[PDB]
Design a protein around this ligand. Structure first.
Ligand SMILES: CC(C)CCC[C@@H](C)[C@H]1CC[C@H]2[C@@H]3CC=C4C[C@@H](O)CC[C@]4(C)[C@H]3CC[C@]12C
Ligand SMILES: CC(C)CCC[C@@H](C)[C@H]1CC[C@H]2[C@@H]3CC=C4C[C@@H](O)CC[C@]4(C)[C@H]3CC[C@]12C
Ligand SMILES: CC(C)CCC[C@@H](C)[C@H]1CC[C@H]2[C@@H]3CC=C4C[C@@H](O)CC[C@]4(C)[C@H]3CC[C@]12C
Ligand SMILES: CC(C)CCC[C@@H](C)[C@H]1CC[C@H]2[C@@H]3CC=C4C[C@@H](O)CC[C@]4(C)[C@H]3CC[C@]12C
Ligand SMILES: CC(C)CCC[C@@H](C)[C@H]1CC[C@H]2[C@@H]3CC=C4C[C@@H](O)CC[C@]4(C)[C@H]3CC[C@]12C
Ligand SMILES: CC(C)CCC[C@@H](C)[C@H]1CC[C@H]2[C@@H]3CC=C4C[C@@H](O)CC[C@]4(C)[C@H]3CC[C@]12C
Ligand SMILES: [Ca+2]
Ligand SMILES: [Ca+2]
Lengths: 602, 162, 81
C-alpha cells in the first residue's frame, strides 16, 4: 500500500511505541483497536495484523471517536530534502511531529508528556479541545470500560477537565491581548482540521464552558451582525426591513455597484433572515387566524389557496431541511421541526376535510374544529423567535426544563382527582346506570375546583335539597357527605400540592438557572449557524429560491458549468495568528505558573 | 351637552388613575415603602416578560375558543371580543363555565352533553390545558422570578433608596 | 485593542481609590461625629465653592452614600436648624 510506504521512519518509531504500548498485558489500546472493526488502511471495510498500529489507522480511530466526518491533513511530503530550503518548513515538521507525539501521549493518557508536546506545538486551543473531547469520549467507550478501568477512566476524566481549563484560559489571554486579533484568529479555518473554523471544533467538543466565554460570544455577535457594524438596535434593523430603499444609503455599513454590494452585504446577514422568518411566521399566524375566524363559504376561498401555496412552500422548506440535514436523527430530535411536522400534517388533514365536500356545513365545522387544534399548534411555533432575546430565552429553556416537575405534579394529583371524582359521582347520583355522563360526573367537576370555581350552588341544585342553608332537609341522609370530601379534596389540592410546586419551582430555578444560560448560549451558536445556513428569501417566495437552487443544482450536475470562488488566507497573516497564539499560549502558561505558586497550600 | 360631559368624565377617569400614581413620590422618605417601591419598579421588567410569555398562549386559546364557541359567523369587533376578553379573566379565578354552557347551546343536565354539534365539546379540553398552563407554569414561575430578583437586588434597592 | 488591560488595571486603581476615602471618613466618624459633620458641610474654595456631598454625587459612587455618617449628615440637613 502506498499510504503506509509514504510514511517516514519517525512514524515507524511512533508505531514501535504503539507496539510497545500494546505489548503490555490487559491493554486498552489493543482492545480499542480490536473493537474498532476497521481496515488496516483506516477505512471501515470491517500482514495487516503486523502493521495494525500504524499512525493513519490511529488517526482514523481518533477521528471516528471525536466527532463525525473529520480527516486531518497529514502532509508527509514536507519531510523531503527538496523542500528543505524553505524558512518555515522546520517549524511545520516540528508541528507535525509534536502533533503525532501529542496524540500518542493523549492515547497513553500521560498528562505531563501531552502538556509538553502541547507546549512545543502550535494551534493549542484546537488541539486541546480535540484532546478534551477525545478524553471525554474515551471514558464512554466500551473497550475502555471494565472492572479495573474505572480509576484510570476517572483520572483520565480529571485530565480531560485539566485540558478543558487551559484552552479557556489561553483564549482569555487572547481576549486580554487583542480582541480584534482574537476575532481574526477564531474565524481562521485550520487546514489540518478539515478546513473548519474552531467554533465548529468547539461545537463538536460540546463543552459549555468554552461557549459561555464572552470573547466567543462577541465573535458570535459579530457573525450575527455580519459585515454591517453593530451600532443598530432591533428597531433600526426592523425599520430597515420595513423601508429598504429609504434606509440603505442612510445606513453605516462595511457608483451603483457599491450600493448593490452594500445591499448584498445587508441581505446576507443571518439576523436579517431572523427578522424575515419571524415576520413571515407572524404573517402566517395572523392570516391563518383570520382564515379560522372567517366563515367558510360553499366554494373554495382565495385565502385558502394562499395558505395552501404558503404551506406547500413550508413543506418544501421542511423537505429542504430534511434533505440537506446533518443526520436524520438530528432532524427528529429538534422539537420545532416536529411541531412543523404536526403543522403540515394537520393542515393536510384540514385541507382534505374541507375539500372532500365543500358544500356540506358539517364537513366545514369538522374542518374548523380540527383547525382549532392547528391554531393552538401554530402559536406554539412562535417560541423559536423568542430565543434571541436576552430575557425570554433562558426562561423558555427553563420552562421546558420545568415541564417535568409539572408532569410529576399531574402524576401526584391524578389519583386524588379520580378518587374524589368517583366518590362525588357516587354520592351526587347513585341508583343510576353507567354511561359517558358517569365519566363526566367523575372527571369534569372536580378538576375545576382546584382553580377557583368550585360549583357549590350547582351541587346544591344537583343535591335535591330545598333548605335555606343549602345542605338541609335533603331526600337522603347519605348525600350530605358531599361537602365533606370536598372539604378534604380542596384542602389537599390547594394547600399541599399547589403549594409544594412553589417549593419545586424555587429549587429547580436555583439549581439550573446557569445551565439555562449556557444552553441558551449554545442555542445561540446553533441559531446563528442555522440562519446563516437558511437562504435569505422569506416563506411566500421560498419556493422561488428553491426553484433557483434546483436550477443551480441541475446546472451543476447535468450541464456542469457552475463554479465558485473561495477566500484564500495569506501565509503571513496565518503566521501572525500563529505567533500571536504562541505569545499568548506562553503568556497564559507563565501567568498560570505565577498564579499556581500564589495560592496558600503550595 | 351631556355627551361632552360624559366624554370629559370618561377621560377624567384616566386622569384620576394617573393622579394617584404620583402619590408614590411621598412614599420614598419612609424606611419601608421606599426600597420596596424601587424594587417594584425594578420588578416591572419581569412582569413585562411574563406578559410577553403568556400573550401567545392567550391569543392562541382565544382564537381556538372563538372558533369553537361560534363558527359559521362573520368577522366583527365581537369576534375580537370573543378572542381576547373571556380567556384573560380565566387565569384570575372567574372562569365563565356556566356562560360557556349558555353559549354552547347544550341542554343536558351535566352541562356538555346532547349538544347541537359534535365538534363543540372540545371547548372544556383546551380550557383544561390553557388554565393548567397559566395557573401552574407561568403563574408559579413568576414566584420563582420574584424570589430570585429580590435576593439579587435588595441591597441595590437600599443604595438607590439612599 | 491594547488599552483593555491598562483600562482594567486602572479600574482596579479606581476601586483602590474608592475604598480608602470611605475608610478615612469611617475614621472621621470614629474620631468625632460633630467635627465630621462640620467637615462635610464645608465648601472647598478650590472645588468651585461646593460641598463634598455634591462632589460625591458627581462621583456617583453608591458605597460612599451608603455610609451611615453621610446618612447622619443627610438627616441633619433634613431636619435643618
Ligand atoms: C391525533 C393527533 C394528530 C392530534 C391532533 C388532534 C386533531 C387532529 C384530532 C384529535 C381528535 C380529533 C377529533 C375526534 C373526534 C371527532 C368527532 C367526529 O365526528 C368528527 C371529527 C372529530 C371532531 C375529530 C377531529 C380531529 C381531531 C380534533
Ligand atoms: C391531573 C389532570 C391534568 C387530569 C387531566 C384532566 C382530564 C383527564 C379531564 C379534565 C376535564 C375533562 C373534560 C371535561 C369535560 C368534557 C366534555 C365532555 O365532552 C366529556 C369530555 C371532556 C372534554 C373532558 C375530557 C377529559 C378532561 C380534559
Ligand atoms: C375518619 C375521617 C373520615 C374523619 C371523620 C369524620 C366523620 C366521622 C364525620 C365528619 C362529618 C360527618 C357527617 C356530618 C353530618 C351528617 C348529617 C347527619 O344527618 C348524618 C351523618 C352525617 C352525614 C355525618 C357522618 C359522619 C361524618 C362524615
Ligand atoms: C392617548 C394618551 C394621552 C393616553 C391618555 C388616555 C386618554 C386621554 C384617552 C385614551 C383613549 C381615549 C378615548 C378613545 C375613544 C373615545 C370615543 C369617542 O367617541 C369619545 C372619546 C373617547 C372616550 C376617548 C377619550 C380620551 C381617551 C380615554
Ligand atoms: C397578556 C395580557 C396582559 C394581555 C392584555 C389584555 C388586553 C389585550 C385585553 C384583555 C381584556 C380586553 C378588554 C376586554 C373587553 C373589552 C370591552 C370591549 O369594548 C372591547 C374592548 C375591551 C376593553 C378589551 C380591550 C383589550 C383587553 C384589555
Ligand atoms: C394529542 C393531544 C391533543 C391530546 C389528545 C386528546 C384527544 C385525542 C382527545 C381528548 C378529549 C377528546 C374528546 C372527548 C370527547 C369527545 C366527544 C365525542 O362525542 C366526540 C369526540 C370528542 C370531542 C373527543 C375528541 C378527542 C379528544 C379531544
Ligand atoms: Ca507553542
Ligand atoms: Ca424547519
Amino acid at each position: 500500500i502506498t499510504a503506509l510506504d509514504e510514511l517516514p521512519s519517525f512514524a515507524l518509531a511512533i508505531e514501535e511505541l504503539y507496539k510497545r504500548e500494546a505489548k503490555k498485558p490487559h491493554s486498552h489500546v489493543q482492545r480499542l483497536v480490536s473493537l474498532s472493526n476497521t481496515d488496516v488502511l483506516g477505512r471501515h471495510y470491517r500482514l495487516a495484523n503486523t502493521r495494525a498500529y500504524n499512525v493513519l489507522r490511529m488517526d482514523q480511530i481518533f477521528a471516528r471517536l471525536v466527532s463525525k466526518d473529520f480527516s486531518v491533513n497529514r502532509d508527509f511530503t514536507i519531510y523531503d530534502s527538496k523542500y528543505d530550503k524553505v524558512p518555515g518548513i522546520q517549524f511545520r515538521r516540528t508541528a507535525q511531529a509534536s502533533h503525532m507525539l501529542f496524540l500518542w501521549a493523549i492515547c497513553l493518557d500521560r498528562f505531563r508528556m501531552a502538556r509538553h508536546f502541547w507546549l512545543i506545538g502550535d494551534q493549542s486551543i484546537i488541539n486541546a479541545l480535540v484532546a478534551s473531547r477525545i478524553l471525554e469520549r474515551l471514558s464512554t467507550h466500551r473497550a475502555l470500560q471494565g472492572p479495573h478501568l474505572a480509576e484510570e477512566r476517572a483520572k483520565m476524566q480529571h485530565n480531560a477537565k485539566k485540558f478543558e481549563e487551559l484552552a479557556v484560559g489561553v483564549l482569555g489571554e487572547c481576549h486580554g491581548s487583542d480582541s480584534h486579533m482574537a476575532s481574526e484568529m477564531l474565524h481562521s479555518k485550520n487546514d489540518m482540521f478539515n478546513k473548519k473554523n474552531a467554533i465548529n471544533i468547539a461545537y463538536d467538543a460540546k463543552s459549555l464552558a468554552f461557549l459561555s466565554h464572552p470573547a466567543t460570544q462577541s465573535v458570535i455577535n459579530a457573525d450575527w451582525y455580519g459585515h454591517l457594524k453593530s451600532v443598530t438596535s432591533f428597531w433600526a434593523v426592523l425599520f430597515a426591513f420595513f423601508f429598504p430603499f429609504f434606509v440603505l444609503p442612510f445606513i453605516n455599513f462595511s457608483g451603483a455597484h457599491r450600493l448593490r454590494r452594500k445591499f448584498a452585504k445587508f441581505y446576507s446577514a443571518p439576523y436579517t433572515r431572523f427578522i424575515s422568518d419571524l415576520l413571515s411566521h407572524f404573517v402566517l399566524c395572523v392570516v391563518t387566524s383570520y382564515f379560522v375566524l372567517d366563515k367558510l363559504e360553499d366554494t373554495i376561498s382565495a385565502i385558502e389557496w394562499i395558505l395552501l401555496v404558503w404551506f406547500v412552500a413550508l413543506l418544501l422548506e421542511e423537505l429542504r431541511q430534511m434533505i440537506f440535514c446533518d443526520g436524520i436523527a438530528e432532524y427528529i430530535s429538534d422539537t420545532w421541526n416536529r411541531l412543523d411536522l404536526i403543522m403540515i400534517t394537520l393542515f393536510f388533514v384540514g385541507f382534505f376535510t374541507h375539500a372532500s365536500d365543500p358544500s356540506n356545513q358539517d364537513s366545514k365545522v369538522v374542518s374548523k374544529g380540527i383547525h382549532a387544534f392547528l391554531v393552538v399548534v401554530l402559536w406554539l411555533r412562535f417560541m423559536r423567535y423568542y430565543a434571541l432575546s436576552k430575557n425570554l430565552g433562558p426562561k423558555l429553556i427553563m420552562m421546558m426544563e420545568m415541564m417535568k416537575d409539572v408532569s410529576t405534579f399531574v402524576f401526584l394529583l391524578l389519583i386524588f382527582l379520580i378518587g374524589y371524582g368517583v366518590a362525588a359521582q357516587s354520592l351526587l347520583s347513585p341508583d343510576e346506570d353507567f354511561s359517558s355522563r358517569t365519566f363526566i360526573g367523575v372527571l369534569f367537576r372536580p378538576y375545576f375546583q382546584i382553580y377557583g370555581e368550585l360549583f357549590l350552588d350547582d351541587l346544591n341544585s344537583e343535591a335535591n335539597c330545598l333548605g335555606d342553608t343549602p345542605f338541609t332537609e335533603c331526600s337522603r341522609e347519605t348525600v350530605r357527605m358531599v361537602p365533606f370530601f370536598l372539604a378534604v379534596y380542596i384542602l389537599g389540592s390547594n394547600v399541599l400540592l399547589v403549594n409544594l410546586l412553589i417549593a419545586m419551582f424555587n429549587d429547580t430555578y436555583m439549581k439550573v438557572q446557569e445551565a439555562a444560560e449556557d444552553l441558551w448560549r449554545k442555542q445561540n451558536y446553533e441559531l446563528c449557524a442555522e440562519y446563516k445556513d437558511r437562504p435569505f428569501l422569506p416563506a411566500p417566495f421560498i419556493l422561488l429560491a428553491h426553484v433557483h437552487m434546483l436550477f443551480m443544482r441541475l446546472l451543476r450536475l447535468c450541464g456542469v458549468h457552475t463554479q465558485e470562488h473561495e477566500k484564500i488566507q495569506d501565509d503571513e497573516t496565518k503566521r501572525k495568528i500563529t505567533t500571536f497564539e504562541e505569545l499568548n499560549t506562553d503568556k497564559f502558561l507563565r501567568r498560570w505558573e505565577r498564579e499556581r505558586q500564589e495560592m496558600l497550600e503550595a
